[PDB]
Swiss-Prot record, chain A:
UniProt record similarity statement: Belongs to the TRAFAC class translation factor GTPase superfamily. Classic translation factor GTPase family. EF-G/EF-2 subfamily.
Gene from which the chain derives: fusA
Function: Catalyzes the GTP-dependent ribosomal translocation step during translation elongation. During this step, the ribosome changes from the pre-translocational (PRE) to the post-translocational (POST) state as the newly formed A-site-bound peptidyl-tRNA and P-site-bound deacylated tRNA move to the P and E sites, respectively. Catalyzes the coordinated movement of the two tRNA molecules, the mRNA and conformational changes in the ribosome.
Domain of life: Bacteria
Descriptive protein name: Elongation factor G
TM region(s), chain numbering: none
Species this protein is from: Escherichia coli (strain K12)
Subcellular location as annotated: Cytoplasm
Swiss-Prot record, chain C:
GO molecular function: misfolded RNA binding; rRNA binding; structural constituent of ribosome; tRNA binding
Function: With S4 and S5 plays an important role in translational accuracy. Interacts with and stabilizes bases of the 16S rRNA that are involved in tRNA selection in the A site and with the mRNA backbone. Located at the interface of the 30S and 50S subunits, it traverses the body of the 30S subunit contacting proteins on the other side and probably holding the rRNA structure together. The combined cluster of proteins S8, S12 and S17 appears to hold together the shoulder and platform of the 30S subunit.
Source taxonomy: Bacteria, Pseudomonadati, Pseudomonadota, Gammaproteobacteria, Enterobacterales
UniProt entry keywords in alphabetical sequence: Acetylation, Antibiotic resistance, Methylation, Ribonucleoprotein, Ribosomal protein, RNA-binding, rRNA-binding, tRNA-binding
GO cellular component, one term: ribosome
Sequence intervals crossing the membrane: none
Entry protein name: Small ribosomal subunit protein uS12
In-chain residues carrying the UniProt-annotated modification N6-acetyllysine: 46
Subunit record text: Part of the 30S ribosomal subunit. Contacts proteins S8 and S17. Interacts with ArfA. May interact with IF1 in the 30S initiation complex.
Modified residues (3-methylthioaspartic acid): 27
Domain of life of the source: Bacteria
Organism: Escherichia coli (strain K12)
Swiss-Prot record, chain D:
GO biological process: cytoplasmic translation; DNA-templated transcription termination; maintenance of translational fidelity; negative regulation of translational initiation; response to antibiotic; ribosomal small subunit assembly; ribosomal small subunit biogenesis; transcription antitermination
Protein name: Small ribosomal subunit protein uS4
Alphabetized SUPFAM superfamilies for the sequence: Alpha-L RNA-binding motif
InterPro entries for this protein: Ribosomal_uS4 (IPR022801), Ribosomal_uS4_bac-type (IPR005709), Ribosomal_uS4_CS (IPR018079), Ribosomal_uS4_N (IPR001912), S4_RNA-bd (IPR002942), S4_RNA-bd_sf (IPR036986)
Organism: Escherichia coli (strain K12)
Pfam families given in the database record: Ribosomal_S4, S4
The keyword Ribonucleoprotein is annotated on this UniProt entry: yes
Keyword presence, Transferase: no
One Gene Ontology cellular component: cytosol
Function: One of two assembly initiator proteins for the 30S subunit, it binds directly to 16S rRNA where it nucleates assembly of the body of the 30S subunit.
Curated annotation (Swiss-Prot), chain F:
Keyword Glycoprotein in annotation: no
GO molecular function: rRNA binding; small ribosomal subunit rRNA binding; structural constituent of ribosome; zinc ion binding
Organism of origin: Escherichia coli (strain K12)
Protein name: Small ribosomal subunit protein uS17
Gene3D superfamilies associated with the record: Nucleic acid-binding proteins
Name of the gene: rpsQ
Length: 71, 82, 62, 205, 85, 80
RNA sequence: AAUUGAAGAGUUUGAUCAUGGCUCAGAUUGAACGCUGGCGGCAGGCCUAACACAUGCAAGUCGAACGGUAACAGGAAGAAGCUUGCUUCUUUGCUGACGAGUGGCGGACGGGUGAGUAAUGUCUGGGAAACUGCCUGAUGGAGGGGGAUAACUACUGGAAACGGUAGCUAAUACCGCAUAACGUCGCAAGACCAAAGAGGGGGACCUUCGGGCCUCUUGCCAUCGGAUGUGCCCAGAUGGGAUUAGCUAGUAGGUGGGGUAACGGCUCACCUAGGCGACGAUCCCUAGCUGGUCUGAGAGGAUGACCAGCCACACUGGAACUGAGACACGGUCCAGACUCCUACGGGAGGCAGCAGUGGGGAAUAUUGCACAAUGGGCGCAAGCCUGAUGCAGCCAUGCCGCGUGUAUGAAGAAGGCCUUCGGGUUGUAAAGUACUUUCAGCGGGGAGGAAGGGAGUAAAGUUAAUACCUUUGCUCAUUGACGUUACCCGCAGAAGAAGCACCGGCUAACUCCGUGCCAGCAGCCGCGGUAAUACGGAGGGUGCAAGCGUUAAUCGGAAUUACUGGGCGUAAAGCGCACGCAGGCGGUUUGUUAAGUCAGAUGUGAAAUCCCCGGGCUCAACCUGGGAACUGCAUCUGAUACUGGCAAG
């Protein structure tokens, strides 16, 4: 959903109380990818040979505004 | 102590050594006292491949230089005894 | 410093973060730099087709 | 790294046939030589001294099918090498394997020659040589591989090749499909109205 | 610091304390000689020089003072013990 | 033979320490004019031999003080 | 054969010539950005914050120095569940081996960075007063005793870091005693100085049966050499500033003491009153130096990434200790700034080693594989360690290769664009039709980097020995991280692979439309106010091509700081006028000198780089043998016209 590729590096699973490290992550699991450059929330990470966009949840849309100045 | 040894000077995957006299402490491709031959493990069965100024090695060996097990096999093969 | 914004139209307002280029505008004494379209918070020139590399416009979908 | 585009276009620009379509018939026409290299092609833009100087090298480049950088590097070498920087640029050009194989008639066009060299269809002295730009020496022997010997292309190629001005600095076969690079051609034994001092005058400033 | 060859630290300490104490007394002996010169006692000077010579030499050997230092002491002490005494 | 050095004495009063000046021509690295180059050296002379104005011949030697690594060999001419 | 190569253009004017600045064509880059992007080879990759750092790794190794047993394994000063020669339990350090400890060697190498340093350094050429681990040559020594202490054991404090008392023990740890020259002091006479043992095997003779004993291999001490390393000294060169002119108390010299490995105001007491500076001291600013790199015809200008030499630094300031070597990058001590741990009493740490995070920024990479190779530490060796190194990953950052097809194809299709409505163009381009299959994909097969070590065995090699040890043949198993390597052989099908800037002059490339001093372009001149080749779109063309542009930057053109190689009547430029110290310059003859100057010879000018000619990777890039070159420096010997010094005119 950005038309750029990313290269996975270190991987971490938050593991009850320790950022345990991983070299492989299978389907049906969750984990956090360290170092990925430009991946915002909602993006799909798919196989480059088998590209697909996924559903992407929805973005709640703010209800309040306020102006701010830098003191 | 001073030593005769090989300083890798080839290029990736195609090394080309430069046998040399040096203070053992210096870097392999570093500071050296004098060049005293070479060894090209590629070369190809062409005209050239290995060269040792055996007279100079012999001389340095005279003042207590030492020799790599690999320079050894390279001398003990370019011969000098029959 | 004061800086030029080339091409037809722009977004660019009081808080825009831009990338400044260098290169004068000899109609605007004092303006000695360009703001590089398509870099950071400056958009490329809408609907342009020629010389797109300047003016930060991407190739339109072959 | 290759031009690929429409080739007569290249020819009509220079105002002369460069044998880019040598293949068979025509040997020009069925293109409308000169009379429209573009929409305004049928004009005589009286072009400057920079103009002719460019166009003349832009011809040589197009004759042998060599792009700028390689060409420049050839220029550098010709300079350096002892000799008249003008002619030994052409020397280098003619010494090209992909050229040599064409001069020997294994392909109709210098392009077709290239495709043969690249598809590993050609050997020098026994050893197969893949790269189009291989500078061939004298006594070397380019030969077509038996693995694809006298099939469709090369038959016809030798055939119209034989019916082409037959070179001198090389001895070709046809039965064994082998040629010997006798020696580097002299400036004399190749030419047309192709200058050099222009191609040199150009790269000096 | 996490490099276990920090035993070198505990080691060379034993060294400092050893060196210190030996290096201490060979100095206090050299002193005894200079004192005699200042006291003027030709006898005690040559006497005290005889007592200090083995110390200076032994320590130089053991590698605590080094050779030429050993020389320099008995060298110019001598020079002086028989310059007025 | 002994790498020595000629040059005239400037200043005298120092008690076995005579300062010798050593003129020398040399061509300017950029512009070519040959120009003078004085070179001052603190020289040891045992038993205050020389004196102001003298021309002296000296040789380099083992250090003798803070800036003092030359002794004389000869004197040559003297009076003023 | 080998530093044999010098280009101009636009722009002041109505026009001109000159002057003069701005501007442009080139080459280059550790680049960045915009649009675009197929592969490979070689190389490069935090230029900013010497900013702060989570995590792991980057320095160990020897049981052949010692006491030793925590774990492994074996054997057992020998034992069950019976699964009687095949197991899993207890002992015994017996042997292999090995946590902790003593001890030895290494931790001063390797690697990182440029903060400081304008001369405490670097460069070039010399010099004398010096030490130097391991390696090496020679000569002898290697005798005989003593006191300890870690570990350990027993109490015992901490959350942790760390320990605390008492007692015990080994050695190549430690200290006497002997021995004492070709060593040190001394004119001599004379005084005085050291050390260590350990392994493999073994005929007898033998003993407390531990081994004495014999042998081979190592190690220990001393002295003198060699080698390498290091310290010290001198001259010359190595940035800018006078809107910095004076500077200097250990200051300059001396004498004598002390001190160092060594010379020395290095230090101290006294005496002299010196020392430095207009040839730029002093004080400011900036800065690692070099080989080289970039540019240039050259002289020059610019520059010091990557490779190699030298120096300096290691959180900041400071100090020493150990040691052959440090005032120590992953050591000690003090202090400071800062961060972290704590059970609140107390503790700990310093990536400018590799990878990596944050931060800063226009911008610079993986928390990878392996010791197979080269090399380094320890070891007799096997081996262990090695983020040095060898490879891979990332990025078009650069260089060099290759591909994205090759031929064929016309009344020249459609469509677009211009059209004087005839046509012209895009364009053999497309389609169509034959052909090839590199490189990507798939399946096969398979070099080289691997030399060595290890077992056996045969050799007047030893030796009391047919042991041990050593060497060399031969023989037998075996040693790649890269690695699905290079490369070759098969398979299918044009199949998976083209962008980017420009087209008014400089400048290669021209039209329609829109727009109407608007919107905008623009390196320089300059375009735009209704027929814009200059703006924006299109068609067409031109140049480049996996890159292309823009920006930034150095040199060039720029003879525009002019040594080479310029000017000052009016263009910028002669001080309003003189006097005159320093400086520069100096008529004419001879003699003398030989500093300048010229000649020769001999040293050195690291290797790499540039160049020449060869050789090796399919070519090229790249790698590589030899040569030339390093135009310099120093020294010795000559020359004596010219210049200078001196003499006399
Ligand atoms: Mg290319
Ligand atoms: Mg142990
Ligand atoms: Mg004794
Ligand atoms: Mg004194
Ligand atoms: Mg003294
Ligand atoms: Mg600095
Ligand atoms: Mg110049
Ligand atoms: Mg510090
Ligand atoms: Mg010490
Ligand atoms: Mg550190
Ligand atoms: Mg940022
Ligand atoms: Mg034009
Ligand atoms: Mg119009
Ligand atoms: Mg336009
Ligand atoms: Mg110039
Ligand atoms: Mg002028
Ligand atoms: Mg004027
Ligand atoms: Mg006047
Ligand atoms: Mg050199
Ligand atoms: Mg004269």
């Amino acid at each position: 959903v950005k038309a750029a590729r990313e290269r996975f590096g270190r991987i971490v699973q938050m593991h009850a109380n320790k950022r345990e490290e991983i070299k492989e992550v299978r389907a049906g699991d969750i984990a956090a990818a360290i170092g990925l450059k430009d991946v915002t929330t909602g993006d799909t990470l798919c196989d480059p040979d088998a590209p697909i966009i996924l559903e992407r949840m929805e973005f709640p849309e703010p209800v309040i505004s306020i102006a701010v100045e830098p003191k | 102590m001073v030593t005769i040894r090989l300083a890798r000077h080839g290029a990736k995957k195609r090394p080309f050594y430069q046998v040399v006299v040096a203070d053992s402490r210096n870097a392999r491709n570093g500071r050296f006292i004098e060049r005293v031959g070479f060894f090209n493990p590629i070369a190809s069965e062409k005209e050239e491949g290995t060269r040792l100024d055996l007279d100079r090695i012999a001389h340095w060996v005279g003042q207590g230089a030492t020799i790599s097990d690999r320079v050894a096999a390279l001398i003990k093969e370019v011969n000098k005894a029959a | 410093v004061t800086s030029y914004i080339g091409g037809e139209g722009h977004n660019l307002q009081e808080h825009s973060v831009i990338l400044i280029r260098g290169g004068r505008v000899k109609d605007l004494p004092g303006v000695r730099y360009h703001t590089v379209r398509g870099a950071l918070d400056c958009s490329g020139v809408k609907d342009r087709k020629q010389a797109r590399s300047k003016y930060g416009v991407k190739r339109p979908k072959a | 790294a290759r031009y690929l585009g429409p080739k007569l276009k290249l020819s009509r620009r220079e105002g002369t046939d460069l044998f880019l379509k040598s293949g068979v018939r025509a040997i020009d026409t069925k293109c409308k030589i000169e009379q429209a290299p573009g929409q305004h092609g049928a004009r005589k833009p009286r072009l400057s001294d920079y103009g002719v100087q460019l166009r003349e090298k832009q011809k040589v480049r197009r004759i042998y099918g060599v792009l700028e950088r390689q060409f420049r590097n050839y220029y550098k070498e010709a300079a350096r090498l002892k000799g008249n920087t003008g002619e030994n640029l052409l020397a280098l050009l003619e010494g090209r394997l992909d050229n040599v194989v064409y001069r020997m008639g294994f392909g109709a066009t210098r392009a077709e020659a290239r495709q043969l060299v690249s598809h590993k269809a050609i050997m020098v002295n026994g050893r197969v040589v893949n790269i189009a730009s291989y500078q061939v020496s004298p006594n070397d022997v380019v030969s077509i591989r038996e693995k694809a010997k006298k099939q469709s292309r090369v038959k016809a190629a030798l055939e119209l090749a034989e019916q082409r001005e037959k070179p001198t600095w090389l001895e070709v076969d046809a039965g064994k499909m082998e040629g010997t690079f006798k020696r580097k051609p002299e400036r004399s034994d190749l030419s047309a109205d192709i200058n050099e001092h222009l191609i040199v005058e150009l790269y000096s400033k | 610091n996490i490099k276990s060859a920090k035993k070198r630290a505990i080691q060379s300490e034993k060294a400092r304390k050893h060196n210190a104490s030996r290096r201490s007394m060979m100095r206090t002996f050299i002193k005894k000689v200079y004192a005699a010169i200042e006291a003027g006692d030709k006898a005690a000077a040559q006497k005290a020089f005889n007592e200090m010579q083995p110390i200076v030499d032994r320590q130089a050997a053991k590698g605590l003072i080094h050779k030429n230092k050993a020389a320099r002491h008995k060298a110019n002490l001598t020079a002086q013990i028989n310059k007025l005494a | 033979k002994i790498r020595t050095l000629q040059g005239r004495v400037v200043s005298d009063k120092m008690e076995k320490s005579i300062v010798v000046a050593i003129e020398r021509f040399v061509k300017h690295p950029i512009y070519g004019k040959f120009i003078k180059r004085t070179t001052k050296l603190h020289v040891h002379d045992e038993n205050n031999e020389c004196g102001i104005g003298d021309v002296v011949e000296i040789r380099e030697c083992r250090p003798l003080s803070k800036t003092k690594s030359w002794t004389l060999v000869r004197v040559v001419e003297k009076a003023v």
